[PDB]
Every structure is written in C-alpha cells, then in structure tokens.
Design an enzyme around this catalytic site. Structure first.
Site, PDB file in Angstrom:
ATOM      1  N   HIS A  25       4.895  -6.260   9.203  1.00  0.00           N
ATOM      2  CA  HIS A  25       3.776  -6.460   8.747  1.00  0.00           C
ATOM      3  C   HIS A  25       3.757  -7.318   7.418  1.00  0.00           C
ATOM      4  CE1 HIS A  25       4.437  -3.057   6.132  1.00  0.00           C
ATOM      5  NE2 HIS A  25       3.392  -3.721   5.338  1.00  0.00           N
ATOM      6  N   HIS A  48       1.291  -8.578   3.951  1.00  0.00           N
ATOM      7  CA  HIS A  48      -0.213  -8.469   3.265  1.00  0.00           C
ATOM      8  C   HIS A  48      -0.480  -9.936   2.789  1.00  0.00           C
ATOM      9  CE1 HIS A  48       1.277  -4.369   3.163  1.00  0.00           C
ATOM     10  NE2 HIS A  48       2.421  -4.693   2.536  1.00  0.00           N
ATOM     11  N   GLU A 106       4.256  -7.355  -2.987  1.00  0.00           N
ATOM     12  CA  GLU A 106       4.763  -5.853  -3.034  1.00  0.00           C
ATOM     13  C   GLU A 106       6.469  -5.934  -3.630  1.00  0.00           C
ATOM     14  OE1 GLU A 106       4.497  -4.214   0.939  1.00  0.00           O
ATOM     15  OE2 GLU A 106       3.056  -3.044   0.111  1.00  0.00           O
ATOM     16  N   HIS A 156       7.574  -8.064   6.506  1.00  0.00           N
ATOM     17  CA  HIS A 156       8.816  -6.986   6.103  1.00  0.00           C
ATOM     18  C   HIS A 156       8.518  -5.525   6.878  1.00  0.00           C
ATOM     19  CE1 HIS A 156       5.004  -6.485   3.709  1.00  0.00           C
ATOM     20  NE2 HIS A 156       5.353  -5.236   3.582  1.00  0.00           N
TER      21      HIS A 156
HETATM   22  O1  LIG Z   1       5.892  -2.086   3.620  1.00  0.00           O
HETATM   23  C1  LIG Z   1       5.202  -0.956   2.784  1.00  0.00           C
HETATM   24  C2  LIG Z   1       6.372  -0.098   2.521  1.00  0.00           C
HETATM   25  C3  LIG Z   1       5.879   0.701   1.687  1.00  0.00           C
HETATM   26  C4  LIG Z   1       6.728   2.203   1.152  1.00  0.00           C
HETATM   27  O2  LIG Z   1       7.242   2.124  -0.152  1.00  0.00           O
HETATM   28  O3  LIG Z   1       4.848   0.671   1.045  1.00  0.00           O
HETATM   29  C5  LIG Z   1       3.782  -0.351   1.222  1.00  0.00           C
HETATM   30  C6  LIG Z   1       4.280  -1.194   2.265  1.00  0.00           C
HETATM   31  O4  LIG Z   1       3.685  -2.228   2.321  1.00  0.00           O
HETATM   32 CU   LIG Z   2       4.034  -3.734   3.389  1.00  0.00          CU
END
Ligand SMILES: O=c1cc(CO)occ1O
Ligand SMILES: [Cu+2]
Ligand SMILES: *[C@@H]1O[C@H](CO)[C@@H](O[C@@H]2O[C@H](CO)[C@@H](O[C@@H]3O[C@H](CO)[C@@H](O)[C@H](O[C@H]4O[C@H](CO)[C@@H](O)[C@H](O)[C@@H]4O)[C@@H]3O)[C@H](O)[C@H]2NC(C)=O)[C@H](O)[C@H]1NC(C)=O
Ligand SMILES: *[C@@H]1O[C@H](CO)[C@@H](O[C@@H]2O[C@H](CO)[C@@H](O)[C@H](O)[C@H]2NC(C)=O)[C@H](O)[C@H]1NC(C)=O
Ligand SMILES: *[C@@H]1O[C@H](CO)[C@@H](O)[C@H](O)[C@H]1NC(C)=O
Ligand SMILES: *[C@@H]1O[C@H](CO)[C@@H](O)[C@H](O)[C@H]1NC(C)=O
Ligand SMILES: *[C@@H]1O[C@H](CO)[C@@H](O)[C@H](O)[C@H]1NC(C)=O
Ligand SMILES: *[C@@H]1O[C@H](CO)[C@@H](O)[C@H](O)[C@H]1NC(C)=O
Ligand SMILES: *[C@@H]1O[C@H](CO)[C@@H](O)[C@H](O)[C@H]1NC(C)=O
Ligand SMILES: O=c1cc(CO)occ1O
Ligand SMILES: [Cu+2]
Lengths: 331, 334
Positions: free
Chosen positions: A63, A65, A70, A109
């Site tokens: 997916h 964001h 991140e 990712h």
């Molecule tokens: O891809 C992800 C993985 C995690 C786990 O730590 O948290 C948030 C995300 O967006």
């Molecule tokens: Cu993520």
C-alpha cells in the site's frame, strides 16, 4: 508524575515505559503500542511499537500513504521491508537490530516479520495515523504487559497497490544485488520521495563535543522530509564530565526519543528527573525546557523532532563529520 | 554498602559492574576487551567478558583450539561471523546478530570475524581464569571516557590456545550460514545432544521453558549438563515479567557462583547485605555461591544472559519448576 501508562490526550511532558499499555491493539499476531499519538503530540508525529512473532506471510498488503511519511526502525528481532517509488527499481532489505528503513509519501511498501522476538519502532509524520490501527485492530487489555500475545481505507490515508509484487530474489538480506547492506556505508537518499535504508552503524555520523561526546546518526533531514518538516536520527551519548554543565534545551517543535541502549536521565519542565531504560520513551512539547544526560557510560536513543532545526540538527551543526560509532577515548 | 565496582575484584564477593566499566580493559589491535568477571573475582568458576570492535575485513583471531576451556559466544549487538569444527565433522559457520548464541566446547576448532561497526560479543568461558591470555596479548587501556572501543606457540599452548594453522574458514556463506543444509533464523535450533559438538542458537529459536512460580519467567537454555559435562555449569537467558499482586519476590541461594548481564530492560538485584541496585543494558551482577539474593524486573519485560557454576543453579531450577513453552512472550493473563 511524568510517567504515564497510555499517551495523554493533550500535549504535555511525559515518559511512558517500554511495553506500557499505550492503547494496545492487535492485528492478527501483531501487537501495536502507541507511545506518542496524534493527540499526544499535537499531531506532530506518532511513535509506535510493533511486537510480533515470525510469520510466513506479509504483515500487510502492499500500500501507499499519500499524506504520511513512514519510518521503520528495528528495535530487535528482524523484519523484511519492501519499497518502491514510481517506476524506480523495487528495493528490499531485511532489517535487524538498529537497522532503519525510510518510506516517504507515495512509496509503495509492505513488510514481513522474520524473527520470534521482533520489535518495529514506527515513526509516522504527521501524527494521527494510528486511528487506522484502532479501527482495523482488536483492543488488547494485555494485563501482564507481555510484548505480544503468545481498498476501503482511503479515509485513513491507506491506498491499495494490488498490482505490486514483493520481489523474491533476496540474498544476504537485500535486493537487488547492486546494493550495500551491512557490507559498506549507506547514504541518505539525495532524491526526495525515494525510499532508502541505513544499516546499523553504516550511515553518516557526526561527533559533537560541546557537552561531553555525542554522536548523531541522521536518518531523515530537511532534504528528505521537505514539507513534512522533521528530523529523525539516533543520538549516542557519553557521560557528562563533572566540569561540564548539562545544557538546557528548548525548541519550537515537539520532540521525543526512545532509548535503545543505556540509561538516560531526562528532566522536562517542572517535572522530576527520571531515568529511562530500554524502549522507554520521553516526549517534550515544543517550547518546553529540558535537560538530558547519560548515566550509562554509553547510551543510544532514537530521536524524532518536529521542525527543521531540533536537537539532532543542532548537535550536527555544532559538530563535525565522524567515522566511528564510538567516541574518543579522551575528553 | 554499594555493590558497584569499576573493575572486577581480586577476590570473591557480591558486586555489580556497569556496562563499559573500565574492567581492567586491554586492546588487541582494534578490539577492546573488558573483564566483567574473572578467575579471581569468581573463584575460578568462570569468566565473563565483553569484546567491542569495529568491522574488519580480516579474522579477529587465528583458528585455534582450547583443550580445557568451554567457550561461549553471545552477540550483545552488531554482528560477527563464527566458524566451528569438531574433529572431522562438517565445518559449521553462522553470522550472529543481536541475541544470537554460539557454543564452542573443548577441542573444537574456531575463529570469528567482526562484521558491524558497533559489534559487541559477550564471552563466557568455563572455567574462569582464561583472561590471563588477554593480559598477555593485549595492551592496557585507560579509556578515560569509557568509549566502547578506540576509534609464541609454547606460550599460547600454556594459555590453552592450540593453533590450527591448516584450518580454512569456509567461504560459501549464504544468508549468514553454511553449509546449506543448516537452520539459521529460519527455524528451531536444538542444543547439541553430542558432547564436544558445537552448536548455534538464533535469538528466540531455541527451546524455552515458562516458569509461573514468581510471575512469568522464560528460560531459554543455551548450555545444560548434557553439553557441559565435567565443566559443570549452566548458561541461558532468563526473560522476566513484573512481579504481580499477592506474589513476593523470592529469595534464592545456590552453592555455585552465578552471574548475569542484562540484555534488555531493567532488573533490580539485591545481594547479601548490600543495598539493592537497578541494572540496565550490559550491566553485570555477580553472586558468590552460597550468598542469598533476590532479583525482579522493574521493566514490563526484561531479558538477561545468565551463567551458573554447578548443575542446578537458578536457571535449571526455573526450568525444573516450569513447563516447555513455545514463545518468547509470556501469557497475557496472570
Ligand atoms: O506499512 C505499515 C506498517 C506498519 C507496522 O509497523 O505500520 C504502518 C504502516 O503503514
Ligand atoms: Cu504503510
Ligand atoms: C536467502 O533468504 C532469502 C529470503 O531472505 C530466500 O529468498 C526466498 O526464496 C524463496 C525460494 O525461492 C522464495 O519463495 C518462493 O518465491 C517465489 C517467487 O514468488 C515463488 O514462485 C515460490 O513459490 C513456489 O515455490 C514454493 C515453495 O517451493 C511452492 O510452495 C509454491 O507453490 C510455488 O511453486 C516460492 O514461494 C521467497 O519468496 C524468497 N523470499 C524473499 C523475501 O526473497 C532465499 O531462498 C535464501 N537463499 C538461499 C540460497 O538460502
Ligand atoms: C552473501 O554474503 C557472503 C558473505 O557472508 C558472500 O560470501 C563470500 O563470497 C566470496 C566469493 O565466493 C568469498 O570469497 C568469501 O569468502 C565469502 N565469505 C564468506 C564469509 O563466506 C556471498 O558471496 C554473498 N552472496 C551474494 C550472492 O551476494
Ligand atoms: C502523492 O500523490 C498524490 C496523488 O498522486 C498527490 O496528490 C500528492 O501531492 C503526492 N504527494 C507527494 C509528496 O508526492
Ligand atoms: C516546522 O515545524 C516547526 C516546529 O513545529 C514550526 O515552528 C515551523 O513553523 C514549521 N515550518 C513550516 C515550514 O511549517
Ligand atoms: C581434547 O583433546 C585432547 C587431545 O587429544 C585430549 O587429550 C583430551 O582428552 C580432549 N579433551 C576433551 C575434553 O575431550
Ligand atoms: C596492566 O595492568 C595490569 C593490571 O592492573 C598490571 O598487572 C600490568 O602490570 C599493567 N601492564 C603494564 C605493562 O603496565
Ligand atoms: C559443580 O559445581 C558446584 C558449584 O560450584 C559444586 O557444588 C559441585 O560439587 C561441582 N561438582 C564437581 C564434580 O566439582
Ligand atoms: O577465540 C576467542 C575469541 C575471543 C574474542 O572475544 O575471545 C576468546 C577466544 O578464545
Ligand atoms: Cu577460542
């Protein structure tokens, strides 16, 4: 009364111990903890911890964001991380203790937990993303404080990438083959929007000798954060010699740190000084005075700051390029 | 009366030595050795030492054997490759990363190589006194700031170091292991059932026992009577929960000396008539045989590296009082 069991619902100085409840939720075999949240930080950033056992399947479907940058830091154990910006080559690393993976906005990712005692520290900017984990997750009372139990989410800034196939030619914890992972130095991406990885101790480092010795290993600088406006790094610390006054700091933006190794004493505002150990987290609101020093002969923390000029950038600026993870033997 | 010392004592007594304490430090090339527990400090029961070093493109020691010492390699952080061979059995090699363990019984050829910049190996050798080798090989280091590390056949044999000049460390390592039919971070690792055979246990992949007598404690045995034989000791990690309602932190006493180095968390130890002390990562506590002690975790989860002289110290006691357990985590309910 600095210590709390769940992150506060408003901005204030606080310390929350490793494995505190922190609004724990589970997603299948994973247990998430939210040491710093949207409400907690004034929406500056989220600092969460994920504890999980080995899994033979991806921990999440690929997916993207669009609004959140991140960061994945391996506290212990190990997990593989895959990432791809646009049509640039897909990158993947297996992160072990102290390794770091940067995942900017619009980077596809996913991840997979490898080792039985794996802990991922996630730093997300800006804060508030954790709502997704509340929504999709199942509440966990977790009375004993055990580390873990033995396409519709656009609203949550989660955009599916069902076409994305995680590469499967990983060798020696990395792919493609022309990469450096634990065998040579790593650099921070010079191109904004591209994912990048820094193996523990293999990235650029700076020595600051203004208040005892401190070594900052930058993970995210302005160059990468651009408009997300934050910095992220580790800060390694010597003790403070008796002839040096421990400085008092204040910065416009909120900041926080999780101790990775050592014993760090923090004093924030008018709260009592408190010594933090492994995985413990300290949060300092913007504009609030704080002092910190290492009681251990060597400590190392994961540090995040809102703004372009917080503590880590300040120490780098007043410091010098340094080639070792250790500081000088003489003051 | 404070348990805290900066170097291991020249005699047996309760003590705690902080991570990166001077600990009679010496350097051998880029490697910095610290002797947290010595022959004289443990009554010759065992040696516990810390080796900090940067990456090296060369071996950290020439292949050799110990005929009378059982060596144990534990990776505190960073990583290093270890090669081991017993007699004519296949040469084994593994790349240890944080929390991994390598067991090297007597008469086993071995060497190692530092991979990561911030690598730390915690060594446990039985019996104690083996450090004399490093006093000879190393150069005294003052290390005022306590930085982790600084940025002849007749004599060696006498230190129980028997070179093996024809040993060729294998060069077909893949995914941190060789040969190919091996299990390393991809499955369960069993303790070797044959004495004299080397073995390796990846962090969290070895056998575990859950003890519920005094809160939850998980013991992951690294060395038992089976493997120690006459060297007469145990080694393992003990993970701990906090001590819950109605439960009192128990008092222990065992005939053989014992010690532990915290890997994760925050552990309080009270030994004999000394004042209690909280330990953090890398800190070491030593308890003379026959002295009463208590320990508990202030952190919600702590993990220590534990060694005991004798066949029935604390760890074996917790195992005997517990049950086989399949997780590095304890149950969510008391
Ligand atoms: O891809 C992800 C993985 C995690 C786990 O730590 O948290 C948030 C995300 O967006
Ligand atoms: Cu993520
Ligand atoms: C070193 O470690 C790496 C992991 O870090 C490891 O890489 C793994 O390789 C295996 C085997 O090639 C991969 O699993 C396969 O993936 C491919 C690609 O999608 C699939 O087509 C395969 O499916 C077939 O095979 C399965 C098992 O044999 C069958 O059950 C299935 O029905 C299919 O016929 C297969 O699942 C895995 O994807 C990678 N993992 C990663 C993350 O790269 C590598 O094997 C190790 N190298 C050595 C030499 O040990
Ligand atoms: C994976 O890493 C290992 C090292 O851990 C590489 O093995 C080295 O390979 C070269 C060429 O065969 C040898 O000269 C060295 O002796 C090997 N070192 C060890 C420690 O065995 C291996 O080549 C890597 N594999 C890939 C495809 O990158
Ligand atoms: C990410 O992509 C979306 C849609 O393409 C766009 O609106 C957004 O501005 C992009 N942000 C960045 C930082 O690339
Ligand atoms: C970046 O963050 C800092 C700290 O919160 C704030 O003072 C500053 O206004 C921000 N800069 C931008 C460009 O928004
Ligand atoms: C080790 O090998 C030597 C050399 O033969 C032998 O004398 C000794 O008995 C062996 N010791 C052990 C513990 O197997
Ligand atoms: C190094 O220190 C040890 C123990 O303090 C001492 O025995 C030895 O003489 C010292 N070495 C030298 C060459 O000064
Ligand atoms: C094994 O060690 C323990 C404790 O040091 C001791 O009580 C016991 O007698 C030892 N056994 C032998 C055979 O020395
Ligand atoms: O082989 C050895 C390696 C080291 C390194 O710390 O110490 C002692 C040994 O016997
Ligand atoms: Cu040896």
């Amino acid at each position: 009364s600095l210590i709390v069991e769940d992150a506060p619902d408003h901005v204030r100085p606080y310390v929350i111990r490793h494995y505190s409840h922190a609004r724990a939720v589970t997603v299948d075999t994973q247990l998430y903890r939210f040491y710093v949240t949207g409400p907690s930080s004034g929406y500056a950033f989220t600092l969460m911890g994920t504890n999980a056992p080995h899994s033979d399947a991806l921990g999440v479907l690929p997916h993207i964001h669009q609004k959140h940058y991140e960061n994945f830091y391996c506290n212990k154990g190990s997990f593989q991380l895959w990432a791809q910006s646009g049509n640039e080559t897909q990158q993947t690393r297996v992160l072990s203790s102290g390794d770091y993976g940067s995942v900017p906005r619009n980077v596809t990712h996913t991840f997979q937990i490898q080792d039985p005692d794996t802990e991922m520290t996630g730093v997300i900017v800006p804060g508030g993303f954790e709502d997704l984990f509340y929504y999709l997750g199942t509440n966990a009372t977790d009375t004993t404080h055990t580390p873990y139990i033995p396409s519709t989410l656009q609203s949550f800034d989660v955009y599916a990438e069902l076409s994305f196939t995680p590469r499967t030619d990983t060798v020696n914890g990395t792919a493609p083959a022309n990469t450096v992972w634990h065998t040579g130095a790593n650099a921070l991406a010079s191109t904004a929007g591209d994912p990048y990885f820094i193996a523990n101790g293999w990235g650029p480092k700076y020595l600051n000798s203004q208040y005892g010795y401190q070594i900052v290993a930058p993970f995210v600088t302005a160059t990468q954060a651009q408009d997300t406006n934050y910095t992220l790094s580790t800060i390694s610390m010597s003790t403070t010699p008796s002839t040096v006054t421990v400085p008092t700091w204040s910065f416009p933006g909120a900041c926080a740190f999780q101790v990775q190794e050592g014993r760090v004493v923090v004093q924030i505002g008018d709260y009592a000084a408190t010594e933090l150990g492994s995985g413990d987290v300290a949060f300092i609101p913007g504009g609030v005075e704080f002092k910190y020093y290492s009681e251990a002969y060597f400590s190392k923390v994961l540090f995040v700051s809102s703004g372009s000029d917080g503590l880590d950038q300040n120490l780098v600026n007043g410091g010098e390029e340094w080639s070792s993870v250790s500081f000088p033997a003489d003051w």
